Design a protein around this nucleic acid. Sequence first.
RNA 1: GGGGCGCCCUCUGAGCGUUCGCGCUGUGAUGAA
RNA 2: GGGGCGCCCUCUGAGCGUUCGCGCUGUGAUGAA
Lengths: 223, 223, 371, 371, 120, 120
Amino acid sequence: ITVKQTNMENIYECEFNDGSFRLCTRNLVPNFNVYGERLIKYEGVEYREWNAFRSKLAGAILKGLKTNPIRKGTKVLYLGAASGTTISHVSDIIELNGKAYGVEFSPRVVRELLLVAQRRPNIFPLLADARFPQSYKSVVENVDVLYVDIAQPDQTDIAIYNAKFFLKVNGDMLLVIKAVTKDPKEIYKTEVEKLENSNFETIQIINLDPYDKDHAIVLSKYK
Amino acid sequence: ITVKQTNMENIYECEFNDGSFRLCTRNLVPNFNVYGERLIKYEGVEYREWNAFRSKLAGAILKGLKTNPIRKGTKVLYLGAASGTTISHVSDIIELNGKAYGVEFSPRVVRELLLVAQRRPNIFPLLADARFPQSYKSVVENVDVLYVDIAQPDQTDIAIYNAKFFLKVNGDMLLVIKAVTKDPKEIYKTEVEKLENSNFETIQIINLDPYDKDHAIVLSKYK
Amino acid sequence: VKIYLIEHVIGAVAYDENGNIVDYITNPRDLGKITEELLNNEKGIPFSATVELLKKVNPQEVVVENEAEVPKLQALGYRVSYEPYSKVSRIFRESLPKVAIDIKFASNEEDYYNFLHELSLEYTRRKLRSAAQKRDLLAIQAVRAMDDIDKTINLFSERLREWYSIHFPELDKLIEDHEEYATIVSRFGDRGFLTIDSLKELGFNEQRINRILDAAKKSIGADISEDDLSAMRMIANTILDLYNIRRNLNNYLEGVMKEVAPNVTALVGPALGARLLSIAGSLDELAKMPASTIQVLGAEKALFRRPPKHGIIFQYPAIHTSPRWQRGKIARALAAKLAIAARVDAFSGRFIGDQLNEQLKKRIDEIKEKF
Amino acid sequence: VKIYLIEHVIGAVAYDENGNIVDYITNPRDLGKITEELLNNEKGIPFSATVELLKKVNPQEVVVENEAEVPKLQALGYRVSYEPYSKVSRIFRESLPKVAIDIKFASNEEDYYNFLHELSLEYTRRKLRSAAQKRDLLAIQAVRAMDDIDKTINLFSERLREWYSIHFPELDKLIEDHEEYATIVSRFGDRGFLTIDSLKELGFNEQRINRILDAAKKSIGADISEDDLSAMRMIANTILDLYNIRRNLNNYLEGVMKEVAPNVTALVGPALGARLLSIAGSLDELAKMPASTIQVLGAEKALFRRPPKHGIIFQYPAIHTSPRWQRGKIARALAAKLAIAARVDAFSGRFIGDQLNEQLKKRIDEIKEKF
Amino acid sequence: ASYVKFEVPQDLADKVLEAVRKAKESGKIKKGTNETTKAVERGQAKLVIIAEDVQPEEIVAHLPLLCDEKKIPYVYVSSKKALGEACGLQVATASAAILEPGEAKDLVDEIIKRVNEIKG
Amino acid sequence: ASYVKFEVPQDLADKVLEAVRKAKESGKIKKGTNETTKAVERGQAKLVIIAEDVQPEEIVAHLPLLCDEKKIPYVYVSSKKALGEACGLQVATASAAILEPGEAKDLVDEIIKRVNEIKG
RNA sequence: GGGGCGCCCUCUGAGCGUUCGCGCUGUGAUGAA
RNA sequence: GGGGCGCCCUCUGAGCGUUCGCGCUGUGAUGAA
Ligand SMILES: C[S@@+](CC[C@H](N)C(=O)[O-])C[C@H]1O[C@@H](n2cnc3c(N)ncnc32)[C@H](O)[C@@H]1O
Ligand SMILES: C[S@@+](CC[C@H](N)C(=O)[O-])C[C@H]1O[C@@H](n2cnc3c(N)ncnc32)[C@H](O)[C@@H]1O
């Protein structure tokens, strides 16, 4: 067992006795997490295992995401919070000085998000439809990164709508698209690429195969 | 989850949801094993996880052992039986038609071997010193493979002594030596290589790093 | 004189066309009020803070963030328009950590986000509060399981102690904590596997470390082998599992208790409120129980004329810390406020915990100051 | 006329210089005898089968496998020599599966290895039988834990059933097996996650599958979400863990029971023999208890003049299968042979289970044939 | 108020008040939310009187759905201060229950048959 | 035999046999390993007689270390067949105990003082 | 070990503090485990 | 022949089956929960 600092801030890698590497986050709240993810100690500090197959974000990092906008003190709007797995890790990366506003739709899942957001005082959970940013306009704040992972056919302009509401100028956006691999570059993803180019700037398009054999992420800068 | 047949008989590989491969044996006795190793089902048949870091043999297989003498119907003399972990897997590979005579010295460990050898009717446990094959000459049988893994400085000729007792002509021998890696081939292991060449034939020398950062295995044919 | 209207958790803020604060009315730090007004803001009803703000400015034209409000504000006789993502509304949120202190909603950043946290949790439970019904019975099963786990731990630890005493009799009386005992059996096994540095990795002072290792060599117990160790460990690790499951169920309990009956929870706590529902049968059956019945939910003491008698409710820190003579007068006050809390959650109403705790605090302080 | 002497589990075999059988005396299939003679062979004392073999040949010169025998065979007046890995001794072992049948030690291969298995286990427990003393008390703690686990399972399963009935009331009466119930909760959770092919993967007949899924749609219970599922699963998986731990302790029990008191075990079984030691306190205290005291180890029935009265020992298949009137006469016979078995293991003596079971079998058959 | 099931005329409202006043010196009544709820559960209650101006409303909202279960009628009064002083008290009461009518036996029997018409 | 603590002369061996025979019609004795062990535990036993030729030996090996604990002397006899027929039985006995000496009161008191000398 | 009637159904129900102005109180005073 | 205190109070202790030859038995017959 060994814990090594990686390129991206507050994100680590975990060397194992069997040789395998699993992504690592600094556990912001010790003692808990309990049953599910594996807990590990190395030189005093407690760390949490970040599986790259459950998390689309963790997939993207292993998939070679060049620049990660989520770091220490980052404020994020997370559209598609779900059961809380993936945000708990951004909660860890963000640290206490940054904040995570999470918006999830189905009640069946939000109740789980609550438990996660209970112990972590940087996650602010919200039961709301992402199509109506007016509904949480009154609760949230202007953020630095827009993470959008909704089970909708029209995600692209649901995010855009949300962006001109809360996303800071010169900010960043991580979109999740149900995207297939050849030797062009982004001509394949022009439908969703050009739709943004009306008011956004494309940086990276990343196909999540084989970590997620369906989706792909588009990192974008807001003008 | 998926189970695929490998080169060696009665030995399988286990594809996982997280991608990792762990060696696999056909569980000869179902329902049990219980607490410790992980139990898995695939298309009716039950399989047992074979960890390559605890077992020196499993290390050797992953380390690229070209020819394994232990197959279906093999009779083995296992010198250094210990707590039973590794023999239970050869018990599985051997199947009911072959037999495993296990010799372990320290009582503290044999009692555990008994529990393992209880449920498996192909393992015949023996509390005995491997330096005195006369002590079990009366119980065992002539075998096909000699596995020797003793915590002694003089293993090499303890095995040789045991071999001319029980090992069949044209049979095989797996020795474990506290053996370092460069670009000769077996000039490094000449001390134990030449000692055998008086009456044995060397086939493979395998350094177990990093599965076992100390030991190495020498597969040998008896003339 | 055109005013841009911002409605937020902190209150109502009037801006000019260039993002300068013209006037503000600050929301009070009450979770119950802000939550309810936020639900109204979705339908288009403005904050009472907005009505007050608009009264003390009476602008020429107002422009609101939300289009649902336009008619409701035109009903008061104001000229109303609607911009969605206005340059003003953004500028407000760009400086949101600061303006919260600037309008005097909070003293610093920490307690603002500590408020926003308590809120975000409450708000998103109110939208759940018109629930998938049966939730109270689940909490009952959750708190009963915790009692079933605690009762199990004692059974296994006693058996583990009696078993392990065969190898190490000295350890049984050295640590009366059942958890720590099972931890030592888990990672070590044999006595001679214990080191000075291995024991500090669990958080032990030097005065007990030198008692354990001195007893390790001076052990009267017999030698043990790895059959017994692997067998003892099975129970030892299960004890450690149950100790986790109990702490984890307690976290689950809080999440259900604050969702189904949040007003009861704010008074007594999650665990005590859960245990009250267990005796009643359901949430509705707690509301039908009057103030006098709640106070005596031990059931064994009244039927004579249970363990920790006069009310099961006395586990409350104000009846436990305070001396024996005050206990009668406090138990009534708690049960009276518990009665309200039950009925208000049975209707599935708002949050009134912030006032009820302050109403109980005033009366507890009025009992302590009467000698 | 030079003879090579081979001593083995099957018996004593005399070979000529070229690996041809000259004469043999076969060992009887008694575990007790062969084990004891094998311990003697280490010191150099020959098998009684060898003494008989050498008498019916009286060779010119004998050559033995083991050097410890040379003096002990020269004491009888034979010319003795010693070859270690003789070409003869190997040839014997080269054909060992066969010669066992050839000298009529066994009828086939299967039961030979089935004997050799029972032996290899016994032999290597005899070398352990002069034990690191305290072993009996461990077995007591092991069997008490099994009773503590069984008592725990019922507590958790009842709680799991009452909890899960909120989501699925129909399931509680459909499966009376506590294990199967917890398995369904573990891998599935929500009712609508169950398929026809998913249920056969656990070993269910078609007549009950169509009862479950028909009750799944016709469920009166309320909708549940993943808080409750993850919470219910904690208990459900723990029940499945304990069900494993119990079966695993039972395997550990056998390994201790056959080591510390193998003669008691051969009569009643591992579990019943363990439970007898629990009431006594130790192995020595069972030996001091006479035949009459063992028979009445219920302690509650005798103090009146317990659950399944006249002796705790009646769980034995011969007192349980046979009718009510024979039970008095069998209970004495078992307790009499149990008395011997206790004292013979208290001295840490040989194995006499193969004769004691045959002695009890003859007397049970003599009770059944008297109408 | 949302816990008020039916509209109550002022004539029947004052005739209810007079029915309780008579039972304070000729029969037996219970005063206060706690005791009123204890009367309906036991089955001793004949008529339940509920105040309309209670804040927060939730304190008495359980009674109407409790009284329907044990088949006992209930009537609303427009004021809590007018119900408090009527019950021989110096403070206001939220709900009152009647066990023994006394001299208001014919006055109660008229009330219970007038409220059943405006229900359905 | 290894459970025999001390060497017993044949003269005292036959004088022990005669002491039990007299107690069968003048006193009370217990016959058999089971009853003999029950006598020593209760404290009713005065003298314990053990057979030397018992197989397996382990059936009676507990008695000598039990009788030392409750301070009761014990003597060995060379044959079990000679102890069986002496006790008025047709089968052999492994051990016998005396509770009431009867006409062998002076004969037992001589035995208990002759065995204490060959012990130490 | 089996069933039909009433009862406690699981506190009491109006006072207490006071500087004699008035305060706290049936949205529970006081008396009990 | 009659009653109050402590003690050992941790089944009983010699027979049963039989073809009338003899068998199974204090290394526990038979009687009980
Ligand atoms: C594929 S999941 C995201 C998984 C997440 N990264 C994790 O592992 O924790 C997408 C989620 O978006 C939610 N969702 C669907 N429609 C939504 C909407 N209109 N607004 C907000 N969330 C929505 C769904 O409930 C679904 O669980
Ligand atoms: C390194 S361990 C083998 C581990 C084994 N492969 C496993 O994982 O199950 C070697 C064992 O040989 C045993 N041993 C030591 N001396 C021996 C001897 N003289 N004869 C037989 N076994 C011996 C020791 O008890 C030790 O546990």
